[PDB]
């Protein structure tokens, strides 16, 4: 008689039956003549795996206390996806907390602009280039060329 079953199946009455696909919950056991019966998850609810659950799960709320907001509302196969506010980024890919974007200080400039999921990279302004302000947007400006200066100040011709 059967011991294990394959993926997306479960053993019941000495026989393999189908698990319910993502998006649906178990409602009635299979028989020897009929396969497992399932029902799509209702509004606000979801199930993201092949499963034998009789109830779906509630969509997570995006915690405002961590500067978090709904980005994509949850489907029946997918949880709520959160993100941060304008001007903040998620600490991780998984977006568990929100942090203000780094400003590149005087003598530095943005090598990379801040995204919504990662942070500003800064570079020290090399020879030939300068910056005099802290900004999460602004890059290193080049020196006025002398066909009519520091990592901070513009040269005077």
């Amino acid at each position, epitope marked *: 008689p059967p011991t294990a079953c394959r993926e997306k199946q479960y053993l019941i009455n000495s026989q*393999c*039956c*189908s698990l319910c696909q993502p998006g649906q919950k178990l409602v009635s056991d299979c*028989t*020897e*003549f*009929t*396969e497992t*019966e399932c029902l799509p998850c209702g509004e606000s609810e979801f199930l993201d795996t092949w499963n034998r659950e009789t109830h779906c799960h509630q969509h997570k709320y995006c915690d405002p206390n961590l500067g978090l907001r709904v980005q994509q509302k949850g489907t029946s196969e997918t949880d709520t996806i959160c993100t941060c506010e304008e001007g903040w980024h998620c600490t991780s890919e998984a977006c568990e907390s929100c942090v203000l974007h780094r400003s590149c200080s005087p003598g530095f400039g943005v090598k990379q602009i801040a995204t919504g999921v990662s942070d500003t990279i800064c570079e020290p302004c090399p020879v030939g280039f300068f910056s005099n302000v802290s900004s999460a947007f602004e890059k290193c400006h080049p020196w006025t060329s002398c066909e009519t200066g520091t990592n901070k100040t513009d040269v005077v011709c």
Partner: antibody
Amino acid sequence: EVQLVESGGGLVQPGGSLRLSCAASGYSFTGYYIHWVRQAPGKGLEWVARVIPNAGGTSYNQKFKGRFTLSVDNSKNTAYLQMNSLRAEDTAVYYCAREGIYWWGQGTLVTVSS
Amino acid sequence: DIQMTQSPSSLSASVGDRVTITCRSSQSLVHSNGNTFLHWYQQKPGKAPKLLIYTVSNRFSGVPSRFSGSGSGTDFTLTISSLQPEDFATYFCSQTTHVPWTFGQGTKVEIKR
């Protein structure tokens, strides 16, 4: 062998009720689902519902979840389809089938008209 | 709901000729226990459907040998090897792997003479 006799059909008016019966023999009644299927004149079969008499489940087509009710009397190895708020497009031959059994009986014609 | 897509809709063929009908399932009709619950019926006007083939290919007791079912998964064929006059009917397939049970749109076969 396993035998299922449909019974109860006839002429009823729009908004009327009607309970059909499926009297079953030749198998262990409580261990298998009885399904109801119907066939409107000129059209294909349409699955209605099923019930298993271990009192351990009933399944209804979305279309009929309000109005129809399956039901069972173990003492008489019989299953019942109760149809309510009948409409003219419920006019059909109502058949009756045990899971595992792929042949059809004669059914019982239900007509719904003024 | 599993959609069964049956074709052709109508055909006409001479006595003795091979007749082929297709059913397709929108997804696999194979149960996890291995059985594939697809079935073929013949239905004559005013009569109940007569079982021809059960579980894809098993010809039902009493059914003539000219009726035979083949296929697997989502792809099935009913063959009448040698059409006969008495074979005028609407033929149609059935899936019972899942509830709701669903059915092909049928094929009306007619003898040409």
